[PDB]
């Protein structure tokens, strides 16, 4: 089966590797952004509550 | 189940001579090879005529 076997898909569709690589890179970038954005919100929440 | 009809599955045709003539069978062997290993459609027609019955191989007069 393609869609389950990477090399079988690449034999039929060589462009599937760059789409898959771009997706994995993009999803890691988006995940990192949402993690850092959320931590900043918590850090601002802590700062606005323990500002003294 | 599949919606097909099985009454015409088997094609009725001569795959070999019904005769037991060993000289006819030897030159059927020769033309079975020549039909398979050449692109000549002449050898294909001659091979299938060798299979045919006597009534399907009528005599040819000299005239």
């Amino acid at each position: 089966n393609p869609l389950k076997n990477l090399r079988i898909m690449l034999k039929l569709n060589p462009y599937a590797k760059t789409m898959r690589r771009n997706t994995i890179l993009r999803q890691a970038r988006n995940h990192k952004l949402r993690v850092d954005k959320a931590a900043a919100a918590a850090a601002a929440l802590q700062a606005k509550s323990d500002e003294k | 189940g599949v919606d097909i009809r099985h009454n015409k599955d088997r094609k009725v045709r001569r795959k070999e001579p019904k005769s037991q003539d060993i000289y006819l069978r030897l030159l059927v062997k020769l033309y079975r090879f020549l039909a398979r290993r050449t692109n000549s459609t002449f050898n294909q027609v001659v091979l299938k005529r060798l299979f045919m019955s006597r009534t399907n191989r009528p005599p040819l007069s000299l005239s």
Partner: protein, 225 residues
């Protein structure tokens, strides 16, 4: 002449390898171009609907030109007209699937077999899942699995279709050579719907499964193959 014949075979082998290399680069770049085309179509419908709503108007999309038809009833007690049309749709078995190009002639055929089929409008994903997992070619009257691109090119290369991506592009965007590319595909032999059906004996709009479910055919397809 041993040295010269070695050179001849090396040159012939190297020439064939370069031809394979060039054909692989073409296949790679066509899929890159198709990916650009697919996202342009997807964004355009969103963009057209947005400018209509901005002006207070209504954007009516193009009527779908591709259908996936699934036969859902068996082969027992079928009237002769329904039996004939199902054969013309290449649906001779239950849970068989076939892509159908939609027009007046084909739609009126779908109305006749309406209690016997479930159909709808496949999206890009459904076409990819069907061709990649269950795509078989009718090659020399034989059901051959689409495991190599050379099987498509030898049968459909005269139409410009030389890879899985070209076959998918022709099916999805109903092209000039849809009839040849669609008839090349052996009709899809799908499994039973995992999770069951609602009711195969009534229409979809009345709580059942028969008839035209517009784009819910994709939900059916995911469970079906």
């Amino acid at each position: 002449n041993f040295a010269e014949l070695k050179i001849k075979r090396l040159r012939k082998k190297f020439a064939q390898k370069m031809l394979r290399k060039a054909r692989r680069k073409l296949i790679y770049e066509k899929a890159k171009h198709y990916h650009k085309e697919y996202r342009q179509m997807y964004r355009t419908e969103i963009r057209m609907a947005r400018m209509a709503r901005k002006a207070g108007n209504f954007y009516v999309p193009a009527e779908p030109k591709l259908a996936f038809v699934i036969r859902i009833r068996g082969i027992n007690g079928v009237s002769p007209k329904v039996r004939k049309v199902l054969q013309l749709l290449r649906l001779r078995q239950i849970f068989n699937g076939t892509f159908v190009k939609l027009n007046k002639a084909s739609i009126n055929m779908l109305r006749i077999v309406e209690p016997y089929i479930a159909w709808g409008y496949p999206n890009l994903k459904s076409v990819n899942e069907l061709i990649y997992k269950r795509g078989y070619g009718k090659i020399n009257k034989k059901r051959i699995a689409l495991t190599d691109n050379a099987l498509i090119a030898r049968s459909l290369g005269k139409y410009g279709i030389i890879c899985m991506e070209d076959l998918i592009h022709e099916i999805y965007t109903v092209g000039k050579r849809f009839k040849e590319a669609n008839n090349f595909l052996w009709p899809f032999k799908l499994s039973s719907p995992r999770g069951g059906m609602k009711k195969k004996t009534t229409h979809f709009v009345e709580g059942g499964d028969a008839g035209n479910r517009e784009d819910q055919i994709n939900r059916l397809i995911r469970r079906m193959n």
